[PDB]
C-alpha cells in the first residue's frame, strides 16, 4: 500500500490519502500514560468498523487487541467516519516489559460521566411595583412599616452616595414580590436638598397606610421645601400604633433638622419593630453602651418568634443587625422615648 | 483446592492422553437419562479458579449461557461439559489450558495451566437453534464448513429422506431452487431452511404449517397432521448464485427480463409465496448503482416498480400489509404516480382501518386517476368504516361516566 | 587572577521609595503593623516587668490609643512601650530591615510565649504611604525623651525639646497628605480594626471629642471607646473553656441574633500545628449559593493577627458553610504577607480541617434531635459534598436519613435499613421522584409493598447527583426499582407461571407492537405490576424521567449532544390485570382495529403520564380526551 | 535642639536573605528575569549597534540558550549581551536595586522602543533561591572576561583568567541544591517558558545531548531546539496582515485543530493605552463551566511579557469564553509583580474590553451565515450576559434571532418582529414553551393566528431569565400570551357579544366553581382561545408553568420558598365550544350531579396537563381513565 501525504490531524493521528481511498494510523506507545486511552480510543475510532474489519495479527500482539475492537454502542466521541484499519506498529519486540494486562474485556464508557453541576444563578422576580401590589394586597402595619425601612435605607444609602432626586414617583420603587404575597424594594434602585428623598418616603407612607395622601390631593406636590396647613395627617384608623403615629407626627416637622435623617428612621425602625417595648425598657432604660447592641440583637431575635409568618423577616435581618453604630443609634431611642414621653 | 480434591478418582474420557474431559460432579440432579443437546438453557455456574488462583468473573452472579449450537465455539470449556451432560442435573468441570475462550489464550486473562471451570448446574438441554420466522428447529447430524453458504438463486443438489412427518412422502431428489419448491410440491420452508445447510452437514427438518407445505394442504401426499412434519433433506452439493459483486449490468438486464416474464407466470399460476423473495432480490438488484449505459434507467426502474406492484398484490392476498407498506413505500420513493400501486397502499390503509391517511392518498390517486371508480368507492368505504368506528365508540361510550355514579351510594 | 572582593553595597533613596510605593498595593495596610510594633514592644517589656518589680511599677497599665485630631489632621497613636535608647533607637530604625525586636527576641534565653508579631523590620516605612512626615517622640528605661523625625527625605534626626513626658509616652504622630486624606473617618477606622488587629490580648481604644455639641444636653461629655470587645477563644484551653463561652463568642464573632449549634476545638500538635476551632450555626444561612465568589469560611489568624483567609484552598466548595477560625503562631509569610508561599501545607491543613469537621458531624449524629434539625436544613450541602469528595465514601455514608416504606414519618438512616436487610435482600430499594404521595403510589413500589420489601423514598431534587455517585453501602448495593431489570427472586412455581404468561402474551406484545411503533423498543410481561394494568420502566441505562428532567432542567446545559440523548424507554403490562387480558382478547381475532389501536394509544400515553415523563404532546392527549367527552355528551 | 541628621542606613545580610526567602511565592519564577535582563541588555546594545557596528561586527549573533548539564547539575544560560565593566558590573550588581539597565535607559536621549522589562533590580539575586552559588563570567565592549562570584554569603569577588572567549560570553551559571533539585527536567522548562517568556522578539533555545543512544540510527545527535516558535502578532499593526496571520497565530496559541471564527484588534490611545486583540473561536468550547481553573480566557501583557492573567477582574463571568490577549507595555506592578496595585484601571480597561468585543459581535451580526452559526452555538452565554449586564441592555437586546410564526423555519431578529404591516396594538407576543410544537399547539396561540398577528417562540430552559429582564424592546413591550391579561383589541361587536356570552355564562362559571373549589381563583369566560373548550392561564404575576417547572428542578434551589410560593392559578373556557355549551346547558337544572362533577374534574385536569403544569397527582388521573377504560370494556 502506498502512503499519502503526511499531514497531521491528531497527536499521533495523521490522515493520509492512499492512491480516492484514505486511512489514518494513530499509534499507541505501549509504555505511555494514555496508552490505555489510545488502545481504547482505537475502538472508538473503530466503532464504525465493518463486520469484517479487524484482522489483527495475533502472535504476541494480542488476539483480544482486536477482538473487542468492534463496537457495541453509538456515543460519538470524536467521529464515526471510519471503515477499515489494521494493527500496524512495532511488529516484533516492542516492549522489554508489558504485563499483557487482560482485565475486564467487555465494559463500556459511562457517557464520559460528565454530570458536574453547571454553576447556578437565581432570578429576581420583578413583575410588580408599589402602587400595584399595594392595591393588590394590604399587609400588616408592621409588615408594611418594614417595607418602609427598605425604602428609607436606600434613601439613606443613596444620599449616602451623595446623590439626590427631588421628587421620586409614587411607583418609583419596584416590588420584587419574589416569594408570593410579600413585596420587596429594588436593591439597584435604578429609577430616580437634604431629606428630599426622605420626604418622598414619608409621602408614600400614606399610600402604604391606604390613607389619602396629602402631598397629592391637598397640594404642595414635588417640593420638599413647600409646607402648609401644619403637615396634616388624615390618618384616622388606629391600626397603626399611636407610638409610631407620634413618630409620624414628628415626621414632616416644621424643620428638616427636627425631621429625622433616613438613618434616624432606620434607627427608629430598627429600634421599633426589632428590640422590644417593655415597662423595664421604659424610661429610656437604654443609655450609652456598646454591648447592648448584642443585647439588642437578642431583643431582635424574637422577630423570628412573634409574627414571623411572612418569612421575609429573617431574610434581610442579617444585613441589618450587623451594620449598626451607637453614634447614630442612640438619638432615635431618645426620640422613640418621646412616644412615651407622651404624658 | 476444591477442584483438585474433586478431580481425584474421576474416570476421564480424554481426547488426548493427558488432555480431555474429566467426569467430576459432586451431586447429580435428576434429569433425562438420555443424552440431549440443547441450544436454549439457563445454566447456573460459579467460575472460580480456586487452586491458588482467582476467577473474579461469573463467580459472583450465575450467568445464563447462550449456547450457539451443539458444537458452540464461544467458550471451549463450556461445550466440553455438555459432553455427556444431562438436562436438569448438576455438573462440575476441570482445567484445560487449550480450551480458552480467547483463542489460545494469554496468561493473565487465562492461567497458562488452568482455564475457567464451573460447578455447572445443568438445566434443560434439548434442541438446537430455532427459526426466527418459525416452523423449524435445527435438526442436524453433521457440521457446516463456513465456506459454502448457499445463496438465493443457487440451484442446489439436495437428496430427500423419503418420509415426511411419519408418512412416506412422494418426491425425488430434484435440483431445487428458491423459486422452485411451490412447483414440485414439497415443504416450501426449504428456501430459508437450506440457509443453515452447507456442504456436508446433514440436517433433518421439523416443519411447521406456516413455514412449509403444511398450511398449504396436500392432495398428493396423504398427511394427517399439517403441523407435525419432519423429514431429512440431503444437500449433497450445490452451485452458487451469481450475486451483486458477481453479476454484471448486462446479465442484470438479462435476469431482470427473465424474472419479469416469470413474474407474469407467477401471477398466472397465482402462486406468490415464491415471489416474495424473488421480487425482493430484483429490488436489491437495482438498489445499487450499475455505472453503465442506462438509457433505459426508466425501463429498469419500471420492472422494479411493477415488482413493487405485484409484491403489494401478494401482501394484499395473504399478508398483514406491513410489507405491503414497505414495497409500495419504496415505490413512492421512486415512482409515486403508480396508477395502482399507491392505490393499493391506501386500500391497505383502509383495511388497516387508517381511513384518514387513506383520505389523503386516495384523493391524491383520484387527482392522478379521475377515471376509474374503484378508488372513489374505496374512499367511500373509508367514510363508512369511520362512521362504523364512530357508532362503535358511541355504543361503548353512552354516559360512560354515569356508570361511575352507580357505584356512589 | 586577582580578586576584587567586596561585600554587597546598596542605595537608600531608591530602595526606600520602592519599598513605599511597591510593597503594599493599598494605603489601608497602615494602622496594623504600628499596632504590631507596639504589641511586641509592650510584650517583651511585660515579660521584663514580671522579672523586675520596679519595672512593673513603672510600666503600669498598658494601653494603645488613637487620636485622629479632625481638622488638624494630626493622626497619631500612643503606646505604653519602653521604646529604645537615643542611639539604639536609630540603630534599629534607620537600619532598614534590622528589627531590634527580633534582635532581643533571639537574645532571649527563656523565650516563653514571646509571640513576636513582626520580624521583617519594614512596617515603620509603610507609614510613608500616608504620612507626609513621620515624627515620633519617645522615652526609654531610665532615659530621656527623644523626638525622632522623618519624611522619607533620605535622612532623619533626633531633637529633644521637652516634649510632654506622657510618662513613657511611646507614640508616633502621622501627617497624611491633603490628597488621599482618608481615615480621619473613625467608623472607617473601626471596620479597619474589625478587619484586622481586632484580636490582640492588650488594651486598645480610640479617643475623640465627637459629641452632639448640643449647647449637659449632650448625652456624653467625651467619647472614649475601646474596640477589643473580644477575647481569643483558641488560646484558651479547650475542654477547660468557660461555661457558655461559645454561645457568647458566636455573637461576638458574627452578629447573629440567634445562637450557635455546636462547635469543636482542636489542639494540633503536628510539625506545624495550630489551634483548630470550628463552629456550626444553629440556623440555616439565608444568604448562601447566590454569591459566586467563595465567601468567608474558616479564618486564619496566624500569630494572633488576622491573615489572608476565606480562600478556597483551605476548604472545598462543599461544606463551605462551615464557620470556624484557625491559627498557628508560626507560618511562612511574605512582605505584604498577604499571599502564601507553599500551598502543600494548605493541603495538609485542609486535610486536617475536613477530617475533623466531619468527625464533628459524626459526633453530632450521635445526637438525634439536633442532628436531625441540622440534617433537615443542610442535607443539600451534605450531598453535594458526598458526591464531590470521592475518597471518604465510608465517612460520608451512614450520615444520611430518608423517608422509607418502613417508617414514612421518620427519616431513617440507610444504616438502619441495612441492619434490617429483609430476607437478606442484597439490594437497597429506593426511588427518585417528585412528590411523596406520587412516590408512595407507584406500580413498582406497590409490588415492593406486596413483597413486603421496604423502599426508601427519595423526593429530593439534588438527590440524583449524589445517588449516581453513591453506591453499595455496607457491602450491599442500591437499587432504584424504576430501573429496567428489577430482578426479584420469586418462587420457582411463580417464576414459571409468570414465564408461561410470557409464553402466551409475547404474541400480544407483538400485537400491540404492530401499533406501538416508533416509541418502545421492547414490551414484555412484568413481575412489577399488581394494581396497574400497564406502566413504563426506564431501560438499564440512561436518565430516569426525573433524572433526565433535572439534567434537562438545569440551565446552561443545552448542548448538541444534549438535544438527542439518553434515549432509553419501554413499558410493560399487568398480565393479571382485567383490562390487560381484555386487550389480549379480540386482539387475536382482529390484527388491525382502530379501537385496539386507539386504546393502546391512550394506554401507553397515560403510562407516560405516570412514570414521570412530561407528556410528549399534551394538546393531542387533550384532543383524544375531548373526543371521549363529546362521547360523554351523547355526541 | 541639636540635630543629629543622618541619612538612612541599612544592613545587607538580613536584607538579602529576606529578599530571597520572602519576595516571591513561586520557585520557578527565577528563569524569567534572567531572560528579561538578557533581553534588555541585548536590546540596548542592539540600538547601539544600529548606531555603530563595532560590537555586532564581532558578535553577529542574537540567540540565547540554556544548558541543564545534568551530568554536573550545572544549570546555566548564555546571552549575546555586552555585559558590563569589571567595576561597573559591580557598581550595578552588588548595588542591590540599582538597575544599570534602568540607568542607561534614562540616560538615553532618543529613547525609541527601549522597552526595558526590568527596572526593580531584584531579579538577579533571585537565583540563590535555587542556586547554591551564583557565578558569572562575562566580557564587555573592548574589555576582558570577568568571572563574578556569589553564594549570598554577604560578599562577592572576581577571580578569572584564560576563560573561553566565546565573544562577549555574557553567560551565568547556576548551581541548585541537592534538595529541591527540580528543573533539570526539560519538558518542565518548556511548560515554564510557554507559561511565561514565550513571547520575546529575540532568539531563544535550549541545547541538550538528549538522544536515543541507540548504538547513527538516532536522527539527531543534539537537541538544538528553539522555543520562540510563534512570534507576537498584536505588536504588528493590524489591517496590514491577513486573517491567516491571526489564524496561524491562535493555532499555535491554543493548539485547536480547528480554525478561529473572527478576531479584532484595537490600538488603544488613552492615557494608559494598550494593544487590544480579541479572537473568537470558530467552534463551541466543549469542556467548560465547572470553573476548576478558569474564570475567563483573556490574557494580559506589559512590556511584551506574560503577566497575571485569568482574573475575574478584567472580564465578567458573562461572556467569559472570549479569547484574546491584551498588552499595555507599562502598568504599575509589584516586586513579585504578580498582584496589581490599582483596580480602578482594571475597571476602565474592562469597560473598553466589553464595549469593543460587543461591537465585534455587532460587526459579526452584519454577517448572517456565520453570525447565525455562532448565535446557534453560543446564544446561551449571550443571554446570560444579556440579563446580567443591566446597563447596555439596549444593545444586548439586538443580536437575538428566534423561531416565530412569522419565521417558522429559521431564527430571526426581534427587529424582524419589529416592523409590522398592521401597525396596530404594538407589543411583543411570545410564549416560553418546552418543545416547539408544544408551543405551536396552544389554543391561545391559535387565537393569535385567527387575529393574524405573528408570535415569537421562546423555547429554552434558560430563556426565562431573559424574559423577565428583557422589557420594552424598541419602545414597545414584550407580552407572553400565557399571561392572564392578554388584552386584545377586538371589534365593537366582538367585545360586546363576547361579554354577553360572559354575562350569561358567569352563572355557568359559578356553577362550575361550586365544584371547582380549592384550585382556581377566578374562572371566567375568555376569548383567549378558539377550537378548544377549556384551558388554564397563569395569573398576572407569579411563575408560568415552564417558569415554575424550572424553579422546582433547579440545582440547590430547594427552600421554604421554592417548596411552595408563587401560587397563582386560574383557567378559562371556550364559550363557543360545543362541549362548553353542553356543560352550560341544564347545569342549573341538575343538583349535585356527578355527571357534570367528574366531568369538570377531568376537564380542569387535562387543562392542567396542557398549560404545562406537571400533573398534581397523576395516579389519580390514571385511576379515572382506568374507570373510563373499564367502561370501554362494557364493564
Curated annotation (Swiss-Prot), chain A:
Its main location: mitochondrion. It is linked to Parkinson disease 6: An early-onset form of Parkinson disease, a neurodegenerative disorder characterized by parkinsonian signs such as rigidity, resting tremor and bradykinesia. A subset of patients manifest additional symptoms including hyperreflexia, autonomic instability, dementia and psychiatric disturbances. Symptoms show diurnal fluctuation and can improve after sleep. PARK6 pathogenesis involves respiratory complex I deficiency causing mitochondrial depolarization and dysfunction. Inheritance is autosomal recessive. The modification Phosphoserine is found at residue 33. The active site is at 167 (proton acceptor). Upon mitochondrial depolarization, it forms a supercomplex with TOM and TIM23 complexes. PINK1-TOM-TIM23 supercomplex formation requires PINK1 interaction with TOMM20 and TOMM70 and is critical for PINK1 stabilization at the outer mitochondrial membrane, kinase activation and downstream mitophagy. Upon mitochondrial depolarization, interacts with TIMM23; the interaction is required for PINK1 accumulation at the outer mitochondrial membrane, kinase activation by autophosphorylation and PRKN recruitement to mitochondria. Interacts with PRKN. Interacts with FBXO7. Changing residue 167 to A: Abolishes MFN2 phosphorylation and interaction with PRKN. Loss of enzyme activity and impaired localization of PRKN to mitochondria. Residues 1-343 are cytoplasmic. Changing residue 76 to Q: In PARK6; no effect on interaction with TIMM23. ATP binds at residues 7-15. It is found in: Mitochondrion outer membrane; Mitochondrion inner membrane; Cytoplasm, Cytosol. The keyword Transit peptide applies. Changing residue 24 to M: Loss of enzyme activity and impaired localization of PRKN to mitochondria. Its cofactor is Mg(2+). This is Serine/threonine-protein kinase PINK1, mitochondrial. Belongs to the protein kinase superfamily. Ser/Thr protein kinase family. Its EC number is 2.7.11.1.
Curated annotation (Swiss-Prot), chain B:
The keyword Isomerase applies. It catalyses: [protein]-peptidylproline (omega=180) = [protein]-peptidylproline (omega=0). TPR repeats lie at residues 256-289, 305-338, 339-372. One of its GO terms (cellular component) is nucleoplasm. Acetylation impairs ability to promote interaction between Akt/AKT1 and PHLPP1. Deacetylation by SIRT7 promotes interaction between Akt/AKT1 and PHLPP1, leading to suppress Akt/AKT1 activation. Inhibited by both FK506 and rapamycin. Residues 30-118, 145-231 form the PPIase FKBP-type domain. It is an enzyme of class 5 (isomerase). Widely expressed, enriched in testis compared to other tissues. Keywords: Acetylation, Chaperone, Cytoplasm, Isomerase, Nucleus, Phosphoprotein, Repeat, Rotamase, TPR repeat, Ubl conjugation. Its EC number is 5.2.1.8. The modification N6-acetyllysine is found at residues 16, 143. One of its GO terms (molecular function) is FK506 binding. The modification Phosphoserine is found at residue 1. InterPro entries: FKBP4/5/8-like, PPIase_dom_sf, PPIase_FKBP_dom, TPR-like_helical_dom_sf, TPR_rpt. GO terms for biological process: chaperone-mediated protein folding; protein folding; response to alcohol; response to bacterium; response to cocaine. Induction: By androgen. PANTHER family: PEPTIDYLPROLYL ISOMERASE. Immunophilin protein with PPIase and co-chaperone activities. Component of unligated steroid receptors heterocomplexes through interaction with heat-shock protein 90 (HSP90). Plays a role in the intracellular trafficking of heterooligomeric forms of steroid hormone receptors maintaining the complex into the cytoplasm when unliganded. Acts as a regulator of Akt/AKT1 activity by promoting the interaction between Akt/AKT1 and PHLPP1, thereby enhancing dephosphorylation and subsequent activation of Akt/AKT1. This is Peptidyl-prolyl cis-trans isomerase FKBP5. The lineage of its organism: Eukaryota, Metazoa, Chordata, Craniata, Vertebrata.
Swiss-Prot record, chains C, D:
GO terms for molecular function: ATP binding; ATP hydrolysis activity; ATP-dependent protein folding chaperone; CTP binding; dATP binding; disordered domain specific binding; DNA polymerase binding; enzyme-substrate adaptor activity. It holds the Pfam family HATPase_c_3. Its EC number is 3.6.4.10. Changing residue 250 to E: Loss of interaction with TSC1 and increases interaction with AHSA1. GO terms for biological process: activation of innate immune response; cardiac muscle cell apoptotic process; cellular response to heat; cellular response to virus; chaperone-mediated autophagy; chaperone-mediated protein complex assembly; mitochondrial transport; neurofibrillary tangle assembly. It catalyses: ATP + H2O = ADP + phosphate + H(+). This is Heat shock protein HSP 90-alpha. It comes from Homo sapiens (Human). The gene is HSP90AA1.
Amino acid at each position: 500500500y502506498l502512503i499519502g501525504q503526511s499531514i497531521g490531524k491528531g497527536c499521533s493521528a495523521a490522515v493520509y490519502e492512499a492512491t480516492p481511498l484514505a486511512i489514518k494510523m494513530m499509534w499507541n506507545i505501549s509504555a505511555g500514560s494514555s496508552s490505555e486511552a489510545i488502545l481504547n480510543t482505537m475502538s472508538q475510532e473503530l466503532v464504525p468498523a465493518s463486520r469484517v474489519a479487524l484482522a489483527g495479527e495475533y502472535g504476541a500482539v494480542t488476539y483480544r487487541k482486536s477482538k473487542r475492537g468492534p463496537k457495541q454502542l453509538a456515543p460519538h466521541p470524536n467521529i464515526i467516519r471510519v471503515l477499515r484499519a489494521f494493527t500496524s506498529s512495532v511488529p516484533l519486540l516492542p516492549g522489554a516489559l508489558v504485563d499483557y494486562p487482560d482485565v475486564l474485556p467487555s465494559r463500556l464508557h459511562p457517557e464520559g460521566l460528565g454530570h458536574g453541576r453547571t454553576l447556578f444563578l437565581v432570578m429576581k422576580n420583578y413583575p410588580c411595583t408599589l402602587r400595584q401590589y399595594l392595591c393588590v394586597n394590604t399587609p400588616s402595619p408592621r409588615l408594611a412599616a418594614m417595607m418602609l425601612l427598605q425604602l428609607l435605607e436606600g434613601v439613606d444609602h443613596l444620599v449616602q452616595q451623595g446623590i439626590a432626586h427631588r421628587d421620586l414617583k409614587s411607583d418609583n420603587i419596584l416590588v420584587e414580590l419574589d416569594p408570593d404575597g410579600c413585596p420587596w424594594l429594588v436593591i439597584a434602585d435604578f429609577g430616580c436638598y437634604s431629606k428630599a428623598d426622605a420626604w418622598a418616603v414619608g409621602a408614600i407612607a400614606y399610600e402604604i397606610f391606604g390613607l389619602v395622601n396629602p402631598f397629592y390631593g391637598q397640594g404642595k406636590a414635588h417640593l420638599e421645601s413647600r409646607s402648609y396647613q401644619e403637615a396634616q395627617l388624615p390618618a384616622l384608623p388606629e391600626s397603626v400604633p399611636p407610638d409610631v403615629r407620634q413618630l409620624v407626627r414628628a415626621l414632616l416637622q416644621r424643620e428638616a433638622s427636627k425631621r429625622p435623617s433616613a438613618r434616624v428612621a432606620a434607627n427608629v425602625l430598627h429600634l421599633s419593630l426589632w428590640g422590644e417595648h417593655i415597662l423595664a425598657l421604659k424610661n429610656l432604660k437604654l443609655d450609652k453602651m456598646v454591648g447592648w447592641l448584642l443585647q439588642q440583637s437578642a431583643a431582635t431575635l424574637l422577630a423570628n418568634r412573634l409574627t414571623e409568618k411572612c418569612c421575609v423577616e429573617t431574610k434581610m435581618k442579617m444585613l441589618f443587625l450587623a451594620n449598626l453604630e451607637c453614634e447614630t443609634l442612640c438619638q432615635a431611642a431618645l426620640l422613640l422615648c418621646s412616644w412615651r414621653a407622651a404624658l | 483446592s476444591p477442584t483438585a480434591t474433586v478431580a481425584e478418582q474421576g474416570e476421564d474420557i480424554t481426547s488426548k492422553k493427558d488432555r480431555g474431559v474429566l467426569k467430576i460432579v459432586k451431586r447429580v440432579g435428576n434429569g433425562e437419562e438420555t443424552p440431549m443437546i440443547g441450544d436454549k438453557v439457563y445454566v447456573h455456574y460459579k467460575g472460580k479458579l480456586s487452586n491458588g488462583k482467582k476467577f473474579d468473573s461469573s463467580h459472583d452472579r450465575n450467568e445464563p449461557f447462550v449456547f450457539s449450537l451443539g458444537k458452540g465455539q464461544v467458550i471451549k470449556a463450556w461445550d466440553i461439559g455438555v459432553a455427556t451432560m444431562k438436562k436438569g442435573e448438576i455438573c462440575h468441570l476441570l482445567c484445560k489450558p487449550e480450551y480458552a475462550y480467547g483463542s489460545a489464550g494469554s496468561l493473565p486473562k487465562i492461567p497458562s495451566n488452568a482455564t475457567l471451570f464451573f460447578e455447572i448446574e445443568l438445566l434443560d438441554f434439548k434442541g438446537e437453534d430455532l427459526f426466527e420466522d418459525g416452523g423449524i428447529i435445527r435438526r442436524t447430524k453433521r457440521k457446516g464448513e463456513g465456506y459454502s453458504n448457499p445463496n438465493e438463486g443457487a440451484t442446489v443438489e439436495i437428496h430427500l429422506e423419503g418420509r415426511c412427518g411419519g408418512r412416506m412422502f412422494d418426491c425425488r431428489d430434484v435440483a431445487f431452487t428458491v423459486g422452485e419448491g411451490e412447483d414440485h410440491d414439497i415443504p416450501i420452508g426449504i428456501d430459508k431452511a437450506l440457509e443453515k445447510m452447507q456442504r456436508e452437514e446433514q440436517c433433518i427438518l421439523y416443519l411447521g404449517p406456516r413455514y412449509g407445505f403444511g398450511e398449504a394442504g396436500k392432495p398428493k401426499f396423504g398427511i394427517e397432521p399439517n403441523a407435525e412434519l419432519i423429514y431429512e433433506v440431503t444437500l449433497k452439493s450445490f452451485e452458487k448464485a451469481k450475486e451483486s459483486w458477481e453479476m454484471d449490468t448486462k446479465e442484470k438486464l438479462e435476469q431482470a427480463a427473465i424474472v419479469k416474464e416469470k413474474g407474469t407466470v407467477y401471477f398466472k399460476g397465482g402462486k406468490y409465496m415464491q415471489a416474495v423473495i424473488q421480487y425482493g432480490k430484483i429490488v436489491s438488484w437495482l438498489e445499487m448503482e450499475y455505472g453503465l449505459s442506462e438509457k433505459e434507467s426508466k425501463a429498469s426502474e419500471s420492472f422494479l416498480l411493477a415488482a413493487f406492484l405485484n409484491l403489494a398484490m401478494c401482501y394484499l392476498k395473504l399478508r398483514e400489509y406491513t410489507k405491503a407498506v414497505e414495497c409500495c413505500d419504496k415505490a413512492l420513493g421512486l415512482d409515486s404516480a403508480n396508477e395502482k400501486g399507491l392505490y393499493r397502499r391506501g386500500e391497505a390503509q383502509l383495511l388497516m382501518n387508517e381511513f384518514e391517511s387513506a383520505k389523503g392518498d386516495f384523493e391524491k390517486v383520484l387527482e392522478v386517476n379521475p377515471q376509474n371508480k374503484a378508488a372513489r368507492l374505496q374512499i367511500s368505504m373509508c367514510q363508512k368504516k369511520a362512521k362504523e368506528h364512530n357508532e362503535r365508540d358511541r355504543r361503548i361510550y353512552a354516559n360512560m361516566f354515569k356508570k361511575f355514579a352507580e357505584q356512589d351510594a | 587572577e586577582e580578586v576584587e572582593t567586596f561585600a554587597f553595597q546598596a542605595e537608600i533613596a531608591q530602595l526606600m521609595s520602592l519599598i513605599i510605593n511597591t510593597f503594599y498595593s493599598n494605603k489601608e495596610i497602615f494602622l496594623r503593623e504600628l499596632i504590631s510594633n507596639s504589641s511586641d514592644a509592650l510584650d517583651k517589656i511585660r515579660y521584663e516587668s514580671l522579672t523586675d518589680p520596679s519595672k512593673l511599677d513603672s510600666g503600669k497599665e498598658l494601653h494603645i490609643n488613637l487620636i485622629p485630631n479632625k481638622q488638624d489632621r494630626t493622626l497619631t497613636i500612643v503606646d505604653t512601650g519602653i521604646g529604645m535608647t537615643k542611639a539604639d533607637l536609630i540603630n534599629n530604625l534607620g537600619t532598614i530591615a534590622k528589627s531590634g525586636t527580633k534582635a532581643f527576641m533571639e537574645a532571649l534565653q527563656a523565650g516563653a510565649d514571646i509571640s513576636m508579631i513582626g520580624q521583617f523590620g519594614v512596617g515603620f516605612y509603610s507609614a510613608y504611604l500616608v504620612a507626609e512626615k513621620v515624627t515620633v517622640i519617645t522615652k526609654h528605661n531610665d532615659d530621656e525623651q527623644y523626638a525622632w523625625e522623618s519624611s522619607a527625605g533620605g535622612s532623619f534626626t533626633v531633637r529633644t525639646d521637652t516634649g510632654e513626658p506622657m510618662g513613657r509616652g511611646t507614640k508616633v504622630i502621622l501627617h497624611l497628605k491633603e490628597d488621599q486624606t482618608e481615615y480621619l473617618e473613625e467608623r472607617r477606622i473601626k471596620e479597619i480594626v474589625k478587619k484586622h488587629s481586632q484580636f490582640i490580648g492588650y488594651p486598645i481604644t480610640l479617643f475623640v471629642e465627637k459629641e452632639r455639641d448640643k449647647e449637659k444636653i449632650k448625652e456624653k461629655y467625651i467619647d472614649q471607646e475601646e474596640l477589643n470587645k473580644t477575647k481569643p477563644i483558641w488560646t484558651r484551653n479547650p475542654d477547660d473553656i468557660t461555661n457558655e463561652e461559645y454561645g457568647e463568642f458566636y455573637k461576638s464573632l458574627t452578629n447573629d441574633w440567634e445562637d450557635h449549634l455546636a462547635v469543636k476545638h482542636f489542639s494540633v500538635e503536628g510539625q506545624l500545628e495550630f489551634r483548630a476551632l470550628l463552629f456550626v450555626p444553629r440556623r440555616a444561612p439565608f444568604d448562601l449559593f447566590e454569591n459566586r465568589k467563595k465567601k468567608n469560611n474558616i479564618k486564619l489568624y496566624v500569630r494572633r493577627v488576622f491573615i489572608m483567609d476565606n480562600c478556597e484552598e483551605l476548604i472545598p466548595e462543599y461544606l463551605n458553610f462551615i464557620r470556624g477560625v484557625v491559627d498557628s503562631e508560626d507560618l511562612p509569610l511574605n512582605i505584604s504577607r498577604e499571599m502564601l508561599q507553599q500551598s502543600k501545607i494548605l493541603k495538609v491543613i485542609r486535610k486536617n480541617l475536613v477530617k475533623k469537621c466531619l468527625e464533628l458531624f459524626t459526633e453530632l449524629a450521635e445526637d438525634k434531635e439536633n442532628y436531625k434539625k441540622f440534617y433537615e436544613q443542610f442535607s443539600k450541602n451534605i450531598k453535594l459534598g458526598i458526591h464531590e469528595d470521592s475518597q471518604n465514601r465510608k465517612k460520608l455514608s451512614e450520615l444520611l436519613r430518608y423517608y422509607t416504606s418502613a417508617s414514612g414519618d421518620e427519616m431513617v438512616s440507610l444504616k438502619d435499613y441495612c441492619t434490617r436487610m429483609k430476607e437478606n435482600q442484597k439490594h437497597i430499594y429506593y426511588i427518585t421522584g417528585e412528590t411523596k404521595d406520587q412516590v408512595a403510589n407507584s406500580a413498582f413500589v406497590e409490588r415492593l409493598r406486596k413483597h413486603g420489601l421496604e423502599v426508601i423514598y427519595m423526593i429530593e431534587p439534588i438527590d440524583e447527583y449524589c445517588v449516581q455517585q453513591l453506591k453499595e453501602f455496607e457491602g450491599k448495593t442500591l437499587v432504584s426499582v424504576t430501573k429496567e431489570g428489577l430482578e426479584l427472586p420469586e418462587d420457582e412455581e411463580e417464576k414459571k407461571k409468570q414465564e408461561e404468561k410470557k409464553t402466551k402474551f409475547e404474541n400480544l406484545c407483538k400485537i400491540m407492537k404492530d401499533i406501538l411503533e416508533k416509541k418502545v423498543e421492547k414490551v414484555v410481561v412484568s413481575n412489577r405490576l399488581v394494581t396497574s394494568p400497564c406502566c413504563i420502566v426506564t431501560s438499564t441505562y440512561g436518565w430516569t424521567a426525573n433524572m433526565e428532567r433535572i439534567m434537562k432542567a438545569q440551565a446552561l446545559r443545552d448542548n448538541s449532544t444534549m438535544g438527542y440523548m439518553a434515549a432509553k424507554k419501554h413499558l410493560e403490562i399487568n398480565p393479571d390485570h382485567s383490562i390487560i387480558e381484555t386487550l389480549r382478547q379480540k386482539a387475536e381475532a382482529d390484527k388491525n382495529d382502530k379501537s385496539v389501536k386507539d386504546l393502546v394509544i391512550l394506554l401507553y400515553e397515560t403510562a407516560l403520564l405516570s412514570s414521570g415523563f412530561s407528556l410528549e404532546d399534551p394538546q393531542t392527549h387533550a384532543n383524544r380526551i375531548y373526543r371521549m367527552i363529546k362521547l360523554g355528551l351523547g355526541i
